[PDB]
Amino acid sequence: MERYENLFAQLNDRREGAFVPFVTLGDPGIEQSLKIIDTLIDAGADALELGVPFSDPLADGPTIQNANLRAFAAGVTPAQCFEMLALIREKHPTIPIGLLMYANLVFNNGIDAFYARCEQVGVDSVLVADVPVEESAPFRQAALRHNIAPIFICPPNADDDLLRQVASYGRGYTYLLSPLHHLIEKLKEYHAAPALQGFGISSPEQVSAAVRAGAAGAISGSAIVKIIEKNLASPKQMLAELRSFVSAMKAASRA
Amino acid sequence: MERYENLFAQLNDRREGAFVPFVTLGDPGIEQSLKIIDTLIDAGADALELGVPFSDPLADGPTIQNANLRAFAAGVTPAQCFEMLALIREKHPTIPIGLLMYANLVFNNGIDAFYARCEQVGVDSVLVADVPVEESAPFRQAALRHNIAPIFICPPNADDDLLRQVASYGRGYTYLLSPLHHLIEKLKEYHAAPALQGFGISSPEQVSAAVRAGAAGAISGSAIVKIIEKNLASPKQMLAELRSFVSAMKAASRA
Amino acid sequence: TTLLNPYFGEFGGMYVPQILMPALNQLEEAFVSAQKDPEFQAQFADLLKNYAGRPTALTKCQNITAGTRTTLYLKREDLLHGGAHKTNQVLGQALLAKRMGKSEIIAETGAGQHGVASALASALLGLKCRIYMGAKDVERQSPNVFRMRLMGAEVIPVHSGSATLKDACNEALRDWPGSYETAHYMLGTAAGPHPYPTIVREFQRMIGEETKAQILDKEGRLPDAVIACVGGGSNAIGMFADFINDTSVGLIGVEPGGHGIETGEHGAPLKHGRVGIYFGMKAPMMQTADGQIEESYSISAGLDFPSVGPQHAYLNSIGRADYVSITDDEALEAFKTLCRHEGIIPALESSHALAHALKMMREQPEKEQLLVVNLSGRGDKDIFTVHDIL
Amino acid sequence: TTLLNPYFGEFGGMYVPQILMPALNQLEEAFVSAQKDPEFQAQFADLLKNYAGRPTALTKCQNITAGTRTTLYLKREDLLHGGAHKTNQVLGQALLAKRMGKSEIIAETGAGQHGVASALASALLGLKCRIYMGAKDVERQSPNVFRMRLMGAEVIPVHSGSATLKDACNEALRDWPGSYETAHYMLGTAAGPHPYPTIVREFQRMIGEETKAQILDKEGRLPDAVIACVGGGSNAIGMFADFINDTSVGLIGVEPGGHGIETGEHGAPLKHGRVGIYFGMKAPMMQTADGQIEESYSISAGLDFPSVGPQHAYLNSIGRADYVSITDDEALEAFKTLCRHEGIIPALESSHALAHALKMMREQPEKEQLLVVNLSGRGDKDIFTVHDIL
Ligand SMILES: *Cc1c(COP(=O)(O)O)cnc(C)c1O
Ligand SMILES: *Cc1c(COP(=O)(O)O)cnc(C)c1O
Ligand code: NA
Numbered sequence A, B: 001m002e003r004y005e006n007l008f009a010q011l012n013d014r015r016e017g018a019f020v021p022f023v024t025l026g027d028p029g030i031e032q033s034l035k036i037i038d039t040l041i042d043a044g045a046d047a048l049e050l051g052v053p054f055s056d057p058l059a060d061g062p063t064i065q066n067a068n069l070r071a072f073a074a075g076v077t078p079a080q081c082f083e084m085l086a087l088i089r090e091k092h093p094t095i096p097i098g099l100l101m102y103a104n105l106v107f108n109n110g111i112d113a114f115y116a117r118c119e120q121v122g123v124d125s126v127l128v129a130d131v132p133v134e135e136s137a138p139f140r141q142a143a144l145r146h147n148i149a150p151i152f153i154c155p156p157n158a159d160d161d162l163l164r165q166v167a168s169y170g171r172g173y174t175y176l177l178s179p180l181h182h183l184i185e186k187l188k189e190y191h192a193a194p195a196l197q198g199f200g201i202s203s204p205e206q207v208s209a210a211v212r213a214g215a216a217g218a219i220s221g222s223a224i225v226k227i228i229e230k231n232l233a234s235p236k237q238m239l240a241e242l243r244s245f246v247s248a249m250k251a252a253s254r255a
Numbered sequence C, D: 001t002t003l004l005n006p007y008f009g010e011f012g013g014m015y016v017p018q019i020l021m022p023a024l025n026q027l028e029e030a031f032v033s034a035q036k037d038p039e040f041q042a043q044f045a046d047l048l049k050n051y052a053g054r055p056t057a058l059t060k061c062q063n064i065t066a067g068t069r070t071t072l073y074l075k076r077e078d079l080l081h082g083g084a085h086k087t088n089q090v091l092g093q094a095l096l097a098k099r100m101g102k103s104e105i106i107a108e109t110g111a112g113q114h115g116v117a118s119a120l121a122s123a124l125l126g127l128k129c130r131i132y133m134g135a136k137d138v139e140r141q142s143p144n145v146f147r148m149r150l151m152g153a154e155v156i157p158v159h160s161g162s163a164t165l166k167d168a169c170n171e172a173l174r175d176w177p178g179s180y181e182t183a184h185y186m187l188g189t190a191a192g193p194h195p196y197p198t199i200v201r202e203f204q205r206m207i208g209e210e211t212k213a214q215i216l217d218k219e220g221r222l223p224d225a226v227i228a229c230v231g232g233g234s235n236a237i238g239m240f241a242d243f244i245n246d247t248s249v250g251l252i253g254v255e256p257g258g259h260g261i262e263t264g265e266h267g268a269p270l271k272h273g274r275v276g277i278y279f280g281m282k283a284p285m286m287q288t289a290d291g292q293i294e295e296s297y298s299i300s301a302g303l304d305f306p307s308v309g310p311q312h313a314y315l316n317s318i319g320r321a322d323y324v325s326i327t328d329d330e331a332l333e334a335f336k337t338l339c340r341h342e343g344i345i346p347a348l349e350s351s352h353a354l355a356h357a358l359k360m361m362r363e364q365p366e367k368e369q370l371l372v373v374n375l376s377g378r379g380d381k382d383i384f385t386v387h388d389i390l
């Protein structure tokens, strides 16, 4: 499948950036998670990034730490997340769906089986948070054999050798971690996958700003997850305020 | 004065041993102590050994440790003991009175002043528990200048040099700490002061036994002090049982 | 790209977020420079001799071995300043921070002994030290938290996850990408991402170097085995390294068997866990079937690291070292036995290595064998755990 | 009659009951034999090196002295096995017991550290150890009582008198006349009747011998002063002895000033008590006007001996050594200051000697001076006394 290539062509036809929310699967429970996700899509998300709860999410700050706490308080496991993903794909055939994973959950019971499971349920990309390009070869090769895009982060200070390697190794999109003007042009120069700016994006003006700098779009997670966190004892308020935020953020991305 | 020489001549004229009780001055208080002492004399004590309460009586076992505890619970001090001694001497002019002291109380404010105070109140001898013959020269010399007998202990295993030194240095009586047949004859050989057996004497048959072995008599303290200890809340019972014990012990000493 | 190999066979590596790679490559390059720099070697040796008290004694224990053909020596890391071997490598790491121009130290700790080590070294060397510690371990390690604070370090409780050592390890790894320019992360065992397994080995290898010189002086030959407990692997690899190429010398590492390996309540991932990837490395881990990391259980709080250094999983796979386990009650017996027969109070971590030497002696009392136990620490800290249980 | 002089000027002697003299003369004669016997010297040196960890480091403390002309070194008795200098002389005394054919050891102790020392040495050397301890100190020194019992010693509470250290000293002196044939009394400081002040000095004099060799190696000249705290006098006389005939070297002993010498609540009998006779000796004592012995007060429980060794009262009277006092709050400040600026936790007893060195530096910061403090012990035992007060 080439869901990301299809998306970014569509959004280039409309001179529009993508707006891509992040949530933890299962937070605050499977049924409410599946409604949160359907609300994100109906409110305008162009693609989703979705976390599988892990015991030691050493690259995440407190808001996502606490999302994973909530999902584990609900008994969420990686096998229940893959059931969720198959359901979300059967409702929504074209939106790209990326996972944010920690290595041990991909390596667990075998890296090629993890990427084969992704391909069976309809996942489009996987970012493994603690696999740097230097350790990535078995992950990227297994991702490519099962038609999954391996996503890499380009750090703010990435030297030229690191830009060329992210360019060569990634597919789908490049995660440009948050004056990106130089790293964006260098990425285009090396024919990298289109860039999505991420970390910190929590307001419409940043969405606009990332698209103006030349990125293809922006990802936001803590800001979406804080809305869940804020609204736990009013699930219907939760859906409405998620809808209001996403609709705003995606409107900032339109030309 | 030569109160001990007078006593032992009198008791030799009657082929009798001396029976000499020990008590702590002030136990369990000054007034009851002064009645205990008068009871000991009326019941037949030939001489008295009297302790001045000291904070660290490192040569005494538990019964006397606790006598000193009781005297300090009553506020007894060495100056109050010397007032007591002057009173006891004014009631009783001929009985010999020996003190059992710890060194620091004699050295405190000067060894010659301590023996001068003894001589003023009418004390006849002083045994300092923690002054061995090797350290005794200033004590014995000051005792002799103020006509006080310095008493030494002859340990059960005393070698010949130690027997000769106790013989030479002591006066009044020799304290033979508890088959003494050899140490008794050696003492007589060296013209020692007559021997009083002490430690453990608590029954009449031992009094008899010490006199038969050749000693001039016997001293008993813990046994007298346990009668005080046993009878504290019945002062009149205390006096009666002290009278019964001393009368028994002195009768064992008669020929 | 690295200067040195980040793996030991399949195990090891650098599994950190991309933004942390430059901090690891910078630390690697500083370390290869300092290992060739004779001035850095003489500053580290002078601190280890005149500050920490090296060399430490090698004590024969003739009362424990009587009536058998075992001769047992104890390498006395309990006499090192701080009471455990952890001081050696903190001093080295602290001097590496200063050589890189850093002013601040980040450390994690579980039972508290690495925190104290890092806080003493930072006080001596004028570094500003902050330590992360799981909040359930702050609550239960009152005395170490106080020591750290006396020594000027900032102790930061970590409440996420299980609020124990692995959660503090994650928090250090979340702070360093924003601070590596002026802060060095002084990792507490021979594990984590390269270069840490190799730097901590090299900064603890004086344990075994001294032990070889001392046993050749006293017996004229090498040991039949050297035996060390294995929490994360630092004291054992510091005893083993200088003996790896002496092929007749056995290398025995002892993991905690807790209430017994069948109960599942143990801390023995090298022989009873599964390989995973976490804390920067591929190594055997305590983990669930689905890959969530779990805690290690032991009566000794210092054997709580839930994996193991990658060089021990490699020396096991090739057969050069052998790894065993000792349960809480064998460790407790060995602690009581050393206190009463040699007048030495051993840490309960080191008591697991002594317990295994005692079983080698007792199981075969007429086998002639020369054994060295690395007595990694003193056990004054354990005397009321031992009280309350008995 | 003795082989060696039992006095130091007016101070010292043998004021025990007659029945104890043969035990002292026998111990004197064994000790003069062992001091000439090269086999006894090589058995004691091997235990002090391979068991106890001698020699101990001499550490320069450049962070404490910055911005002044003081250079301060700390002689590291805190790194000795057991955590304090008391181990050195217990090992010697234990070997003297065995050379006399004794099988049993009697000791007294106050804060518990001598009890632990004596129990470790008795466990190593196969002696049966009983210790007397005032019952108010058993109650307040739970951790040391337990250590002793772990090491196989019998701890006997003493309830008489004030139920503190002097009361345990009396109880030892009441048991020995019935047991000296098979039991040796291992006295805990350089005091008591001859020969103990002289035997404990000789068995602690390696402190100062090592310090002289170490400071000549590192600075090429002797110290301007060596400074040690004075409870009963053992660690100080072990630092001072090898320097007595180096007339340019100051010898400063520091007694505890408690809440301040004017309050009367102190433990400084050498300079603020009166000479008396007790525990076997003529020496300055804490005593009432009428001659009852009193306790010493200090925040440090180990400075509780209520007199002082006779050789310090003599070295004071002739002007060879100088003795001062430091209050509880100066000791506490010096403990906090060493923890934060050198990463060393000192015992509160030794903190009194460090406090006085800090006042010599701070009072005259441009005076050039080379100072050695004897760091008699480690202070892990004190960290919550220090907590609770702050
Ligand atoms: C922490 C500690 C250990 C375990 O750590 P390793 O890295 O495996 O050495 C062992 N002994 C002591 C005394 C410890 O403090
Ligand atoms: C007991 C002790 C002291 C005091 O005893 P001294 O005989 O005066 O040395 C001093 N420091 C430590 C650490 C102690 O344990
Ligand atoms: Na482990």
Ligand code: NA
Binding pocket: D230, D231, D232, D267, D268, D269, D296, D303, D304, D305, D306, D307, D308
């Ligand atoms: Na004192």
